[PDB]
Structure formats: structure tokens, C-alpha cells
Paper text:
To contribute towards understanding the sequence-structure-function relationships of type II bacterial TSs, we determined the structure of the terpentedienyl diphosphate synthase Tpn2 from Kitasatospora sp. CB02891 by X-ray crystallography and made structure-guided mutants to probe its mechanism. Canonical bacterial TSs are categorized into type I or type II depending on how they initiate catalysis.
This is only the third structurally determined bacterial type II TS and the first from any organism that produces a clerodane skeleton. At the bottom of the active site pocket lies the catalytically essential Asp-rich motif D294xDD. Docking experiments support that the central Asp, D296, is properly positioned (3.2 Å from C14) for both the protonation of GGPP and the deprotonation of the syn-cleroda-13E-en-4-yl+ intermediate (TPP+). D296 is also suitably positioned (2.8 Å) near H342 for activation.
Residue numbers in the entry: 1 to 79, 84 to 138, 150 to 217, 223 to 509
Write the structure that this text describes.
Amino acid sequence: MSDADRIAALLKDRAADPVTKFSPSPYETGQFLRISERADVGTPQIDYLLATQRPDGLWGSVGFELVPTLGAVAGLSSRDRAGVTDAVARACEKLWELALGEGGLPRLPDTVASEIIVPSLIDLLGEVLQRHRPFPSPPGAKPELWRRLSDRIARGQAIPETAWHTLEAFHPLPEQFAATVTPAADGAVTCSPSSTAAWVSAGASTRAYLDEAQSRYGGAIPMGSSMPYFEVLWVLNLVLKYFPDVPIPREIIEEIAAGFSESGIGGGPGLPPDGDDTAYANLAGDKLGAPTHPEILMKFWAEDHFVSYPGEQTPSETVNAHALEYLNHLRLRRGIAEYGAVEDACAEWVISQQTEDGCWYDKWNVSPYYSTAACVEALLDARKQDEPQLDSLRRAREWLLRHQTDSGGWGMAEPSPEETAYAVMALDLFASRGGKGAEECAAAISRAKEFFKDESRENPPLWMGKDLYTPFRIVEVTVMCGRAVVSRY
């Protein structure tokens, strides 16, 4: 009974249930509890919020605590039961402990709409827990932007469909604005159960969607939904590198082909086209004999770099990695450097985003292991072999070798199978090129054998929505690719 057979089994089941599998979040559970009215269900969410709370009374991963901790307490302050106020009391006591310290509150992580989620919850939760005192004011927190959209909504003036993702920031939603909103063909308002909730509180497809979302895990609410293209393209683009001779469902091919359009493809329907998924639809298309067009990708190109979204506040480093990979593959296969200009420029740009320590980060996943391994696949096959590129790649690898742990794995903090599979993946590409360092890259991988075959550990949430989450299908495949690399050394 093979992993190969398993991926093939995963691929058949993916084509059966196109329902996206993102891990629950205390923020999304925290907002859903507050908003889905008449208490269709309340206690199931409460139980889940108390078990996942951290000993220090907070919620979330170390350095991404505010948005989830505010989300949960808002939920447990709305409308108590056993240990709820104890939770609410100890959570709030540990929040003023930080807002009253050195530098005050740590800057907002660049998690989706932190800029809005955080001001909104503190106004609402200010009046809730102004007590438990002897104000917060996060550095990246833009109340101005929050209050602006607030009164744009009340005037019945349309809002960017990007904020439709986080309507739960506008708690009492006026009806004349709710009538502007249409949910997707699956019942979701812009990929978020708690935003859909806000819409509803102010219907068949949408109830079925919320039925499933309050049932999958016993009450805990999936952090986001409706993103079958994202989780399809990332799975398929790892099956195509580490599992050739596993047969891909046609029905999955046609599914991508359905969502791909003039302006490209988004993470899912209800999202606009983005450079990441367009620059991965293309690549998988190529690898499978589909007629693919770089002309569409150039539409996500700006001056010096490809953009996740044409309106780019802060740019994304994996988008440029994912796009260059496609451009390298096309030049190597087609035999012409048609985008010679963009390749080099995108290569320059990728290099200038590396930190002094040797790794990259990304807008979309918060572990440098995702971003570094992606930037490294792109750079090894980058056409020029400029000293900037090989010195870049030389520092990247060095970083990779020096951060391995006694367990054999790697991690932005505690080691994990997702981040270990990223390092071992990035090492394999080095070992299989040769030269100085290449044999230390392989030894490093042989050492990962123990980490993987060892315990069934858990997957920390490293991906960035409005809070962090595991995209389970994508992480399911990543770890097995790491193992396939591992079980070649």
C-alpha cells in the first residue's frame, strides 16, 4: 500500500469533494459565535475555544496572537459557562501585560486585513473589557482605514470586493449594504464563513455551506473556505515533480480549465485573478501538454516584479519564485528565452528581498522554509548564472544546513514535517546539481529520514489568511514529497 497509490487515492477523492480543507482558527470560531444569531449553535464553539487557548491565556502561534486572541474573547464576551470568564479574564490580563511594557504591542503581522480586524475588535471589545485594567494601540493598526470603510458602508457606497472577505469587521451590518453582497455558487461570501455569517445575520446554498462549516470539526470553524484552485494547483504542481507515473484525474484538469480565463485564474471563484495561481496554472498546464500562455502572466507583471494582486500594498516573494519557475521551464523546454527581460529582472528583484541571514520570507506563508525553498527552485534554473545569483544561492543553502536540529528536521521555531519537507526539498535540488556543499546537502537529507519515519507529529499553521491555518490537502502532499526525497538517500 504505497504513498504513490495514496496520492492517486487523494487525487480521486479531491475530485469527489471539491470542498476546501483549511484548519480551524480561534479568530474565525470567535467571530462566528458572536454573529450567527438566535444561537443556531453556541456551546460547540465555546468548548473548542477553551481547549486551544494557551497556558499563558492567549490564542495562536507565537508572534501571531492578537487577531486570534481578540477574536475568541469577542466570541466568549458575546451573549456564561464553565471557565469562560476565567478564559476571558486570564486572556485580557495577559493582553494589557504586553500593551503596557517595552515598545507596547508588537507590530501587526501582515495577516489578511489585520489593518481592519484589530481596530474593529478593540472598539467593540474596549467597551466589553475596558475593565480588567490596573487602551491598546497596535503599530500596524489603521483605525482611520477602519472608520473610513465603516461609513462608506453606511452611506451604501460599494466597498472593494476584497473587504467582502472581512465583513465581520463591520459587526452591525446595515441591510441596504448587505443587499450589495452576493455570495459565491457554494454559499460563501468571498471565502470566509464568519463574513458569510455577518451577511446572513443582516439561502439554501449558504445554509448547506454553513451547516458543513459548523459540522466538519464539531463546532470549530475552518479559517477560510472556497479556494479549490489554490489547493488543486499546489497539490498537482508537487505530484508533477515527485510523483510522475501517478495518473491525474481529468475532472481536476477540466476544473482548472473552467476557472482559467482571459485575465488568468484566482485561488478560487469569488476571488479576482492572481499572479501566484496564474503562474502555477500555466506551469502544470505546460507539464501536461495543455496550450499555456505567458502573455496572461505578463498581465501580473509590474515594473520590477510580478504582483499577487494588481493593487499591491506589500508584495509577495513566492509569487515571483512561482512565476520565474514557469518562465525557466518554458525557456528550457521551448528552447527560446522569449521573456529574457522579465526572467533576469524578476531574478534581480527576488535576490534584493533576501535578508542578511540568507533566507527569504513571503506575504502568504510565514515560515521562511516555504519562501526559501521556492526562491531556490526558481534561482537554480535561472538563465544567467550571475555572481548575485550563485552568491545568493550559496547563502541560501548555508542557512538551510546551519538550522537543522538534533531531531533531523527544521523549523521557524519547533521543527515540523511541512517545514522539514521544504528544507529537504531545497537540499535535494542542491545535491543533484553538484560541487562545493552538494555532499553536505545530501547528508543533511539522510538525517531527515529519522525525523519523518519517527512520530506522527502535528502540522503547525504556517499559511496566512485573516489568521494562520493548515491547507490540509496541500500539507498532506508536501510531507509525502519530503519523504520521497528522504527515501532516496
